[PDB]
Design a protein around this nucleic acid. Structure first.
Ligand SMILES: [Zn+2]
Ligand SMILES: [Zn+2]
Lengths: 163, 365, 365, 163
DNA sequence: CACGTGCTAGCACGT
DNA sequence: TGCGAAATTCCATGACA
DNA sequence: ATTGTCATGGAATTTCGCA
DNA sequence: CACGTGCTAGCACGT
DNA sequence: TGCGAAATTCCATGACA
DNA sequence: ATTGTCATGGAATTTCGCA
């Protein structure tokens, strides 16, 4: 097909429950398919209602052609269906139990999942407040496969906060 | 009557000779084409120019005519202007007949996140109990983020900017000297993140022009969409943010979204002319676009402009003058000439101040 | 797909031929220097221009670029502009990029008492419990009368004007459409004395320029005299009235007192160059001065001005638009072109209105 | 000397008491020496205090070189003395009991004094309200001696309200 | 609490 | 080439404070 | 120590379709 | 009482 | 006559709403 | 049925004193 580009697919997924940091028990995770750029949204529940609220912030910045996710309840509602269509995002799911993204994403959803846990019982119930910094390192992590970082890939420039 | 030798034919510099200077009623007179006028002694003259002027604190020519109604002396306007120069009321009340230096057209931020431009739109119609909006405009691209707030306070400003800087961290952030931007609390947050705070000269929104000019587009489209319908605007900011970031500036032929990303997202009428190029061949072409963008130059200086020279005496527009109060502070000295439109003055209170020449007039005489 | 004969080589007017028009995905396409764009049927086009525009109600060029991202058709901008013309929100929200016609420089009243110009300065600092001032400027001379009042009401206006017209009765009296001047009660008094009432077009103080411009001089000198002292201004009006009436306009080289009387009263620096001439030889010379007075002409029209033609569609600036509301009323028709700066419109409510072109924009398209 | 001009001398005098029209018992009378132009001021008393109040209105319009009057109390105060000097008006008086103005004024002070009385028991205690109209006719009355009216002489123009 | 900077309210008159 | 029509670009005007 | 800005739509100008 | 025309008030924030 | 200095005039800028 | 205005002070321009 044609070359992989940013916004082509946003891979989403939850992470939780976690310790109640400021009242936020989960984390909606959005990764760009091509740049590996990652957006993190603390939510109080992995629900369509809390998910929509978050992807409504994201989609006021950019809109993906396809959101790709797992078959978790939140992501397979009628609500989330109708929400997707109204915006012209195509919904796409991994076939249940046997998940599948891409190499880039598979590693990043790991990077995050580990980058989170150093902050788990390393920093008690105080992770909410540092969620943005997690995001920043995440987006400034040099890629071996592609010579660049997500922040360089997405925006096309050196970042002012490199890791 | 000291330089009185004129009656005795003696020639005193500045006094034309063809005129006969006679005496009458204990005043030296002189028959002029105007009529017969009285020549007062050099000692009296200041007292007379003062007397005449203070009638309605009339300017040069107006003050002279009054004087000419009765008297003649060598180079009247010189003695006249000297006083207009020493009249504290006229100096601080009379408007200026010099216009500012032509505007600077600052070079536009080299890359995204180089300079942010922030402001506070509102108060506005309470929609969802939110009264204000925090506008954040990237300098280079014009990408804009719109954060609804209940107050123009450090709280919400930091609260928004944290969310915003989960995406990226900007080198410098520019803003008017509004309450919440000058706050030490904000100064902190800024420094924590190693962000440089820049501030527009006071009472000079042109300097936060990028936000302000987006302030229009935001407010204009927000209006077009609340036609014949309540002013509930909260639920429309996102809509407006997308709509605007993805709207082509005809000069540049690019959307603010484009200059930030190089590629259109899943928005309507999305442009796909770089669908062939690999992301590298895409990103590369972007640094090529971001360099050759149109840039306006300084317009011609008005024929009656004025330029800030160090040590020159200037005055600062009174921020909020009361009713029937002077609009100009007492005159102050130029210390630094930052640029042809920015000046460090010895403020009247008595501080160092960085002001736009737009809030200064040069002191006349 | 109705004019589809293009795939069959048929030549349809407006469609360049060197381009091959193929089919794909059930859409007629065309390979262009831009890329490959989709040609929609003539029926769909309006629906697409509408769809594109309504994204941020973008103007001509902005709306087109969006459209060009995907489609091509003959003379795109025509279908585009046609809609901008039928969009009630843009029509009434978008500012104008045409400036007004150049100003008129009305001939100045032929003699004293020909036209009076009246206004209400204030509210101001309560001095002696008076809040306002009634300014009365003679048109021809610029002689000015200043009457302190507690309210901008018909009461005090008539009450002053009676006192004033114990001196003389004026042919016509001009004023803004302020509350007390439009009053029937005042309309009476005016007619009782066979005085003609004239009214400036609404929301257009330039038209009461003579009062307004004296409004400055009054307010400016009043200020110079309350420097470092309470704003008690009541006891200073007379002082200001004299001072001002007797202050030389440098252009004309005459005081408003002079143009009214021909001879200076017992005021300071009083001019006596007509002390020789008998009052007839004085009064005569006056009608000679009052004729040869300087008069400014209409300045050049802006390169992008606009002139009111009958039947042309124009719109009236919304007097006091709310927050986030359009600034333009719906479009209206020009009935009478009173002059190149004044227009009778079919008001939106739906009346006849006489407006300054300064509160109109020509309707685009 | 040099030709008679307006403002050269303002001849003043009172007229009263009269019927209490709206509370005004007297009338301060000012006539211009040269144009015969006349100013009328209803006052509640022929006092310097009420006189000053009136000539303070007049002198915000024009200022005479000389105010000439009779030796009536109001006009010969210290107050009225000091008031005159502050403004640079020279004060001048008729020698007591044997008054003297000019022909023009002598006739006008009559014109007024009669023009008033037609309005006396011709129009009851309602003369205050018509005082301005008295003034207007007074100033538009064709002079036999000088070919002109005061309003023509003072302002140099036809008046819009001629008699 | 008044000051500075940033903002938009509001009140009077006569119909 | 050169012409007439169409598409582009220019730009001063006004609104954001 | 800081600096005006850009959508807008008739008017001008440059480019395009076709010889 | 709200509307029109003419005017100037005023309030929020952080120090 | 023409020159240098002084006096006049021009004028765009800003403030009145 | 209505219409912009004029004090202001450096800069330009015209006039004046003296040959
Ligand atoms: Zn002064
Ligand atoms: Zn529209």
């Amino acid at each position: 097909d044609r070359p992989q580009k940013p916004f082509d697919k946003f891979f989403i997924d939850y992470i939780g429950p976690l310790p109640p940091s400021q009242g936020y028990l989960y984390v909606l995770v959005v990764v760009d398919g091509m740049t590996g750029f990652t957006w993190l949204y603390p939510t109080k529940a992995p629900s369509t209602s809390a998910t929509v609220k978050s992807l409504n912030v994201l989609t006021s910045i950019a809109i993906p052609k396809v959101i790709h996710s797992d078959q978790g309840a939140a992501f397979t509602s009628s609500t989330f269906a109708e929400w997707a269509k109204e915006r012209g995002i195509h919904l796409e799911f991994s076939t249940p139990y046997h998940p599948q993204s891409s190499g880039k994403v598979e590693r990043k959803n790991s990077d995050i999942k580990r980058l989170l846990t150093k902050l788990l019982v390393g920093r008690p119930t105080k992770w909410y407040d540092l969620l943005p910094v997690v995001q920043l390192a995440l987006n400034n992590t040099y890629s071996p496969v592609l010579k660049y970082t997500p922040h360089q890939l997405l925006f096309g420039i050196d970042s002012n906060t490199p890791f | 009557a000291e330089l009185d030798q004129l009656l005795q034919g003696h020639y005193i510099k500045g006094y034309p000779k063809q005129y006969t200077y006679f005496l009458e009623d204990g005043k030296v007179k002189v028959s002029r084409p105007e009529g017969v006028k009285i020549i007062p002694p050099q000692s009296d003259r200041q007292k007379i120019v003062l007397q005449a002027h203070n009638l309605a604190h009339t300017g040069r020519e107006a003050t002279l005519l009054k004087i000419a109604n009765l008297y003649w002396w060598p180079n009247m306007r010189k003695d006249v202007v000297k006083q207009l120069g020493r009249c504290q009321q006229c100096l601080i009340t009379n408007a200026s007949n010099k216009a500012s230096g032509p505007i600077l057209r600052p070079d536009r931020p080299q890359k995204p996140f180089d300079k942010f431009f922030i402001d506070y739109i509102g108060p506005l119609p309470p929609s969802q109990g939110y009264l204000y909006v925090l506008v954040v405009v990237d300098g280079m691209t014009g990408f804009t983020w719109l954060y609804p707030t209940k107050a123009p306070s450090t709280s919400a400003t930091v609260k928004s900017l944290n969310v915003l800087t989960s995406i990226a961290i900007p080198k410098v952030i520019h803003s008017d000297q509004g309450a919440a931007f000058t706050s030490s609390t904000f100064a902190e947050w800024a420094k924590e993140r190693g962000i440089h705070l820049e501030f527009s000269t006071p009472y000079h929104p042109q300097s936060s022009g990028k936000v302000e000019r987006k302030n229009s587009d935001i407010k204009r489209l927000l209006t077009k969409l609340l036609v014949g319908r309540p002013t509930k605007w909260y639920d429309l900011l996102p809509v407006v943010q997308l709509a605007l970031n993805n709207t082509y500036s005809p000069v540049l032929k690019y959307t603010p979204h484009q200059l930030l990303f190089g590629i259109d997202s899943n928005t309507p009428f999305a442009n796909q002319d770089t669908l062939d190029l690999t992301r590298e061949e895409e990103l590369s072409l972007l640094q090529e676009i971001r360099t050759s963008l149109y840039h306006p130059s300084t317009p011609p200086a008005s024929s009656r402009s004025w330029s800030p020279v160090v040590g020159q005496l200037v005055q600062e527009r009174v921020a909020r003058p009361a009713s029937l109060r002077p609009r100009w502070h007492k005159p102050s000295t130029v210390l630094k000439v930052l640029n042809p439109r920015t000046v460090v003055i010895l403020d009247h209170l008595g501080n160092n101040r960085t002001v736009s020449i737009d809030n200064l007039k040069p002191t006349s005489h």
